[PDB]
Design a protein around this ligand. Structure first.
Ligand SMILES: Nc1ncnc2c1ncn2[C@@H]1O[C@H](COP(=O)(O)OP(=O)(O)O)[C@@H](O)[C@H]1O
Ligand SMILES: Nc1ncnc2c1ncn2[C@@H]1O[C@H](COP(=O)(O)OP(=O)(O)O)[C@@H](O)[C@H]1O
Ligand SMILES: Nc1ncnc2c1ncn2[C@@H]1O[C@H](COP(=O)(O)OP(=O)(O)O)[C@@H](O)[C@H]1O
Ligand SMILES: Nc1ncnc2c1ncn2[C@@H]1O[C@H](COP(=O)(O)OP(=O)(O)O)[C@@H](O)[C@H]1O
Ligand SMILES: [Mg+2]
Ligand SMILES: [Mg+2]
Ligand SMILES: [Mg+2]
Ligand SMILES: [Mg+2]
Lengths: 65, 171, 422, 435, 429, 412
């Protein structure tokens, strides 16, 4: 999906300043490229309500919604 | 078509106003903070072309000032002065109003602005040079309809006055 | 002169120093026992010690129940909250019956808060974009740094240099009221309105006392109008509507008000809720009133009822002495109003005539009293103004017996109309 | 001639109560026929309304169907004029999905109380004889106005220049400038634009030159009801709800604030209260909750004069199982005066038919008048009234000038009244549903 | 239009010039007295003199009440607004019943607006200002406009120069200029300058046809309810209103009075012409007591349309009342305000005529013996049932390769499908 | 400290159940009098609540009007710790126009179960010495330190103007700076670690996560029918917190006074609602005998269907004797600071036995007022007689309504 999430600053830089309003998260342990087969259980009603009304839209009408 | 009759009638101020309660947490989650931040950013970016409209159509009426009409109606002297000034203005005359009280001069200022009459105020706190400058301006500028002077001001420094009518508001 | 209402003559209870009712005082006539009981109730309200005490005015129609309630309201004064309401008003289409009852209970609790208002006023000199703006007055000039919200408020007012503005920093509200009178001569004709320069200091602190109910705080915090922020502004566009205020909000307001009272910057003034037609409530409302009246926060509540043994609204075949279930009659003190004797009716008619500016002769007064012995007191009173109109038309400045007779022939009472129909 | 929005209605012949100076009704005046006692009572009630000193006076017009209760109400409305508000509602109008019955009754009461505001305004009025606007590419300008008595040259501020440009003020325009707010209104032109300009395809009439001084102190009268004030103050966009009716239950605190400031405006010189009339026709459609609200509502000092009409005898009060006169509780009946209307006679019916023929512009013979009066006495007054129109149409179809007996017999045979239709329904009852 | 409905054969009241009803004309058979009275009602509607006059069609089911109302509508033409309603529609969830009734009343009053616009349109060929000495000064702006008919030069007021640059009008641009305001509006480059290689859509327009200067008449038909809805909620507040559900609103009498005033001003000015019409309320017995009471006041208004009620309920309990029976489910108070037209049961011959007319309208060939058999079925059962058998019998015949209905097809279709009475008989057993 | 918001109500004298460690009820303790069996049962129920192991336990308090059922409930609320939630609603409060009856009961149930979350945070509080933009110098009365500022912390200090001499507190993890004045300077450590413990009800979680700025619906109402999926996901997340140890569950009490106003639909919902593992302890009160269940034609022992009555234990409240009534009057007088003579106490006890206990309680205040009017100090028999003459009880009022039956409306 190409979604990017910035999950904080690396804990190696925790000493770069004595007082910063940042969330330090440890460096990931595994490899850079991670593969995992997963399963999710959903109901048809969940799909119904997901498609009932637009969500995540950046348009002003979606923001008002 | 109601705008003029709307603004004469919009007067209710709420007895209490309060900002929305703010949900306070220690250690707010990064995801929640980011979602709120982007939501607000998007709303401000989309509202920017219409922001003043939102401001005017949402801002509540918090203050209620007394109408300038009340200054004239609270004093019979101001009413009789209004009638006198209207009659004198119709005759193209210039009027000098003398009062002993500074606060009364301020009330006369509010009264004259309510009647859209141009005026110059000379009190005792104006220096002699300022008093001469203001009187020379009054004599020069024939458009100034009234000059309001404090009786306690040293009027002995004003020799020439190009006005034909003097009104003593108080003794 | 102000318009004359049905209860305009009522100026109080007319009790002496020993709390006994005078026969005719303060507009009220007779009902001495009920006036004395309402006296003890007024003293209870003034004591401010007891919460939730309820009283029921029960008696035949026209026997003074509403007049007694308004006499209590007059004796208390304008300082003490008094919320008149009708039981039929609880059937809101917007909120549930219990929310309406609770909101009326909270309306009847007053709060005098002394608040320090700091105001910046003057003629604007500079509007440098946080903003360092300048204000100039009759005393001097000051430079001030303000929040960007205040700058957005100034832009909403479209303030330009040379304009006279009033800034209440407490509420973040700016009122541009004119351009300075100094500029008032620059142009022979301009669209703006000029106002004199302020005479006081630029920054002034004034202490004021604000009277609000607890309900005012509740509604203000429930639907906030002071956010002045993007999300709150977008919310303010929404259609206004009464909302079911939660107990959490009321508890938070209670805590805030307790803190205010502890700091001494506020005083709490318990008042009265008056429900005229309590028999119009249903069993749900009475069941809620059970819990509501037992609360330590509730005001003094006054009830009126003229029903006999009638059916409680919302039940099938449950009858109660006034339409109020026996469980609520146990929680209230009952004051009985008795029927008026003809002499009391004549006194009340004379008082009503004197309140309406109507002159009436002794024979006309006696005929009107006789009419009131039949029909009802209200009907006999209601004949005063038509009869005075006919007097004026006939060139007389006083009602005579002939005018009373003519008006009674023109207008029929409930009993006469029922006889005609039957 | 031209078909207006208002056409000939059921009460178009009513012009008033038809009373003299002593409120003694005339036999036939202002479209009223008969009902001498009821019309005298209506005149006394109208005087009570016009005096305005007494609040919450309720009058109930009770009588048989078709005896003129709505006619008397419309006569009171006509004799009251447009200055005094007169709100007429059907009793079934209060049952709303937007608001409670008590809120509806409050809005009806507050709609029947006018607030007559007065304010003084500085008004400039004159002919534009020259206008010059110079702008960079701040704006500067000069405007000269004439009024036969004087000609003054004005130096224009930026805001006035913007307003004049927006209004597109040109020389030869008779304009009005409100010095209090700079609003510019054009009354009309004083002479044509240059003939040399193409398009500009108009030759509008030219208003006469203003006279007197250019700037006058003008007093203006604006009247709004309490309901308009309430709706305007209920929310930021309240004024839009005055037309759409999307008014929720207006907060009682706002109403108390308005009642207080209106009392101040009447202690000051700013406004004058014009208390009017709320007419609840067919009041028996109200339920017990509405009558119980009306009991307390009439005790308010801001309550108007409430007029009610109903033909029900001793009937069951809606929402209850109790029977009371007029379908109104005895507690509200105690708070009102009842005015009774009497059935008409042959002469009164004939005069009513004559007035209806005159308003419908139907020429009809005296024998036709006699047969129609007999029909109206036998069947109903409204049935005879509707036969007037039907017989007029039938007569015009045959190219006749005066409605004769043959036309009345024709339309009587064509259109049935309740009684003959009921008899025929009973004669064929098996064909109708559920017997 | 193209599909065939139950009333598609009703083309009007079969009345002569003398106002009498022909035995069978315009698709209607019988109902002579009721068609004659409907004729007087049609004349009443066309007279435009009266307001709020009510007529009640009353009679057994299948006696042409709705057919007579739609025949009145056909007689009145498409200019007169005819608004059909059924009594079940007042029970809305968005607005009160009296609002639904008042809205349908205002739907039946038509208004015809006449707008006459003077416009100078064409392709701009020159925009030369006219310099002059003031008594650079310009005294006129000459615009040359080209159309397929020719070219015209206009000596426009100099002030139009602002609008020309605002609209960015250039040589070769098609514009139109209204006579009154004198403001120019640009509508794209003339298509004579469009190449096939450039990509734009809105910015090109064909050269105007006709004379450069045009006088256009625009006639629009509206109802008073259309104006009510338009002025009640004009189209960020618009954004929120369009996002949220735009429910019906209880339009206040203030708005209706203002709109009446505006329409009277237009009629005085000659811009508009009123076309008062008819509100038809079928199944009026579905209304409740509150609706009938409201109708008492509504029919007394000088603005109301002519209303046509229909009922078949006979002596039935009034909806919203308890045990209060009335001759038609309508309170006697309302019945005193209405003229009643009775409708009568049909004879077998009239039933045969109606069946034949229906078969003609449906395009069905029916044999004489088949027509007689279906008529005799319709003298039993109901007329509606016998009519409904037409097209299934035609289809059964088409299956059997017959271009016309034979009696055997009617027999078979009757054996397949049953009427209300046969089903009641089966249910009883 | 005058005229506080909390004033003297009907149940102000009740401060607890007045039980020993063996749950033996004292005759007069913590404002309670008599009802020994019912108070013992209330104490057993209270111990059940405090343990919180069992879910879905329902108790009904039944008895005649005035027999102290709501008093017992208020005592149980007072004895129960303020940390543990105690939701008290009337039965008519579930008939909302904004939510279904089952939704209102669901929200009430979820308001009675609390999630207790503890978390640590680091708080910096001191006096500003020097600010350079970045470097920040802070000092206390015992220590001073200089901090190196980050970009976001520099932005935070720039938005909220901080200068030398100001006393401010800063949240180290978030940079939340609030100025509390200018300089007493804080005494101890500049940087402190503080644990903070919040108890959040399941309903607060549901509404907070229902929508953007959903917490506003916890105050104004405006909470629609919350989706079942959100509730299930929250129930699973809360179970996960309990397993991981991040949160503890604090089961509370939902009290429905006059539950007989509920309808058969609400009772049927309660039948299944008490079967969840997150169901709280339900307490109900009702004076109805065998009477019709609202929404049905069926009569039931308490207006409650026998399905629900089978899921609950019933606590009965007896009438009071003369001694208990006199003691209750004494405690109410002490609560209201009213002094009465012994003969006045006897007369009021006789009145309470004859007419009603609440009538006697009201007469206490009435007689106190009448005594204050006559410049008295102790309420005498004359004052009780005066207030008995001025104010009527239901029985006497009914007798007078019968005496003048012809004047009343719809009398039958
Ligand atoms: N004791 C009294 N003295 C003077 N006027 C009274 C008295 N009792 C009632 N009235 C007046 O007579 C009318 C009857 O109203 P009221 O008796 O208060 O109605 P109710 O008591 O049935 O609610 C009102 O105008 C009221 O002010
Ligand atoms: N006294 C009268 N003068 C003139 N017209 C009348 C009179 N009484 C009744 N009418 C007319 O006869 C009809 C009767 O209807 P209406 O007055 O509404 O009676 P009600 O309201 O009592 O049912 C209306 O058209 C009315 O205008
Ligand atoms: N007199 C008639 N002439 C021709 N067709 C008719 C006649 N009467 C009824 N119809 C037709 O037969 C059917 C009868 O239905 P309708 O007129 O709606 O009866 P109802 O009076 O029950 O509403 C309709 O299709 C109608 O067009
Ligand atoms: N055992 C008791 N000890 C002290 N006060 C009591 C006791 N029982 C009842 N009361 C008080 O008597 C009054 C009536 O009791 P309450 O609990 O309200 O009865 P109900 O069960 O009808 O609600 C209240 O003021 C209550 O505080
Ligand atoms: Mg009353
Ligand atoms: Mg009528
Ligand atoms: Mg039909
Ligand atoms: Mg209880």
């Amino acid at each position: 999906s190409g979604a990017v999430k910035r999950q904080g600053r690396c804990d190696t830089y925790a000493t770069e300043f004595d007082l910063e309003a940042e969330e330090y998260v440890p460096l990931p342990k595994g490899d850079v490229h991670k593969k995992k087969e997963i399963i999710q259980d959903v109901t048809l009603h969940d799909l119904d309500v997901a498609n009932a009304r637009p969500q995540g839209g950046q348009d002003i009408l979606s923001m008002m919604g | 078509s109601l705008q003029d009759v709307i603004d004469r009638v919009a007067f209710v101020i709420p007895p209490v106003v309060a900002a929305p309660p703010s949900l306070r947490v220690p250690r707010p989650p990064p995801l929640y903070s980011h979602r709120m931040r982007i939501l607000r950013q998007g709303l401000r970016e989309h509202a920017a072309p219409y922001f003043q409209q939102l401001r005017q159509t949402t801002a509540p009426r918090l203050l209620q000032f007394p109408e300038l009409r009340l200054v004239q109606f609270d004093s019979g002297k101001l009413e009789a002065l209004a009638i006198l000034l209207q009659k004198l203005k119709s005759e193209g005359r210039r009027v000098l109003i003398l009062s002993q009280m500074i606060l009364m001069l301020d009330i006369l200022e509010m009264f004259l602005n309510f009647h859209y009459l141009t005026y110059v105020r000379i009190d005792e706190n104006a220096s002699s040079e300022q008093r001469q400058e203001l009187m020379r301006s009054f004599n020069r500028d024939r458009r100034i309809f009234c000059a309001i002077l404090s009786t306690h001001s040293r009027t002995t420094g004003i020799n020439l006055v190009e006005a034909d009518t003097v009104v003593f508001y108080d003794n | 002169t102000q318009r004359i209402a049905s209860h305009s003559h009522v100026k109080g209870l007319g009790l002496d120093e020993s709390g006994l009712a005078k026969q005719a005082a303060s507009g009220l006539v007779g009902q001495e026992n009920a006036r004395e009981a309402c006296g003890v109730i007024v003293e209870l309200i003034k004591s401010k010690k007891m919460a939730g005490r309820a009283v029921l005015l029960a008696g035949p129609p026209g026997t003074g129940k509403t007049a007694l309630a308004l006499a209590i309201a007059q004796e208390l004064g304008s300082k003490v909250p008094f919320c008149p309401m009708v039981g039929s008003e609880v059937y809101s289409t917007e909120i549930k019956k219990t929310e309406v009852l609770m909101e009326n209970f909270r309306r009847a609790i007053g709060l005098r808060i002394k608040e320090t208002k700091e105001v910046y006023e003057g003629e604007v000199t500079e509007l440098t974009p946080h903003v360092i703006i300048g204000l100039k007055t009759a005393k001097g000039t000051k430079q001030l740094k303000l929040d960007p919200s205040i700058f957005e408020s100034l832009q909403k007012e479209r303030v330009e240099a040379g304009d006279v503005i009033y800034i209440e920093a407490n509420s973040g509200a700016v009122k541009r009221q004119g351009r300075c009178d100094t500029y008032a001569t620059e142009f022979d004709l301009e669209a703006e309105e000029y106002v004199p320069l302020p005479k006081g200091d630029v920054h002034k602190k004034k202490e004021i006392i604000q009277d609000v109910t607890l309900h005012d705080l509740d509604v203000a915090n429930a639907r906030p109008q002071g956010g002045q922020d993007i999300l709150s502004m977008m919310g303010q566009l929404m259609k206004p509507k009464k909302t079911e205020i939660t107990d959490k909000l009321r508890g938070e307001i209670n805590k805030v008000v307790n803190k205010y009272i502890d700091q001494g910057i506020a005083e709490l003034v318990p008042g009265v809720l008056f429900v005229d037609e309590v028999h119009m409530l249903d069993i749900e409302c009475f069941t809620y009133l059970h819990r509501a009246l037992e609360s330590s926060i509730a005001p003094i509540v006054i009830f009126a009822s003229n029903r006999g043994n009638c059916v409680i609204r919302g039940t099938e075949d449950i009858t109660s002495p006034h339409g109020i279930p026996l469980d609520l009659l146990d929680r209230v003190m009952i004051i009985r109003t008795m029927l008026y004797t003809p002499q009391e009716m004549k006194q009340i008619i004379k008082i009503r005539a004197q309140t309406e500016g109507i002159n009436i002769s002794e024979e006309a007064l006696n005929h009107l009293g006789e009419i009131g012995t039949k029909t009802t007191l209200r009907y006999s009173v209601q004949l005063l103004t038509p009869a005075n109109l006919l007097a004026k038309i006939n060139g007389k400045d006083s009602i005579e017996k002939e005018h009373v007779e003519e008006i009674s022939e023109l207008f029929y009472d409930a009993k006469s109309s029922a006889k005609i129909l039957a | 001639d031209v078909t207006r929005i208002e056409r000939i209605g059921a009460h178009s012949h009513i012009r008033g109560l038809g009373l003299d100076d002593a409120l003694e009704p005339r036999q036939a005046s202002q479209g009223m026929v008969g009902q001498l006692a009821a019309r005298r009572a209506a005149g006394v009630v109208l005087e009570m309304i016009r005096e305005g000193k007494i609040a919450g006076r309720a009058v109930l017009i009770a009588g048989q169907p078709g005896t003129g209760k709505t006619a008397i109400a419309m006569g009171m409305a006509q004799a009251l004029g447009p200055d005094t508000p007169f709100t007429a509602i059907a009793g079934s109008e209060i049952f709303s999905l937007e608001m409670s019955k008590t809120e509806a009754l409050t809005q009806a009461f507050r709609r029947s109380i006018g607030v007559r505001i007065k304010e003084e305004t500085e008004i400039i009025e004159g002919e534009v004889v020259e206008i010059q606007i110079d702008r960079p590419a701040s704006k500067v300008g000069k405007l000269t106005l004439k009024t036969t008595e004087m000609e003054t040259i004005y130096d224009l501020g930026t805001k006035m220049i913007e307003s004049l440009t927006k209004d597109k003020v040109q020389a030869g325009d008779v304009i009005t400038i409100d010095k209090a707010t700079g609003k510019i209104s054009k009354l009309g032109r004083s002479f044509t634009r240059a003939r040399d300009y193409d398009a500009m395809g108009s030759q509008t009439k030219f208003v006469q030159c203003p006279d007197g001084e250019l700037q006058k102190r003008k007093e203006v009268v604006h009247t709004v009801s309490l309901h308009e004030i309430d709706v305007i103050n209920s929310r930021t966009q309240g004024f839009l709800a005055l037309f759409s009716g999307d008014t929720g239950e207006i907060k009682s605190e706002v109403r108390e604030q308005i009642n207080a400031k209106v009392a101040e405006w009447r202690e000051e010189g700013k406004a004058e209260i014009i208390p009017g009339v709320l007419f609840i026709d067919e009041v028996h459609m109200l339920d017990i909750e509405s009558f119980s609200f009306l009991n307390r509502a009439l005790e308010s000092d801001m309550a108007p004069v409430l007029i009610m009409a109903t033909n029900r005898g001793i009937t069951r009060i809606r929402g209850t199982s109790y029977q009371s006169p007029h379908g109104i509780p005895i507690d509200l009946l105690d708070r009102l005066l009842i005015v009774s209307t009497t059935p008409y006679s042959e002469k009164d019916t004939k005069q009513i038919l004559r007035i209806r023929c005159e308003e419908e512009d139907v020429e009809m013979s005296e024998d036709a008048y006699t047969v129609l009066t007999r029909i109206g006495l036998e069947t109903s007054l409204r049935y005879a009234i509707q036969l007037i129109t039907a017989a007029s149409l039938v007569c015009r179809k045959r190219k006749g000038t005066e409605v004769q007996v043959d036309d009345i017999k024709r339309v009587y045979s064509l259109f049935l009244d309740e009684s003959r239709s009921t008899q025929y329904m009973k004669e064929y009852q098996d064909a109708f549903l559920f017997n």
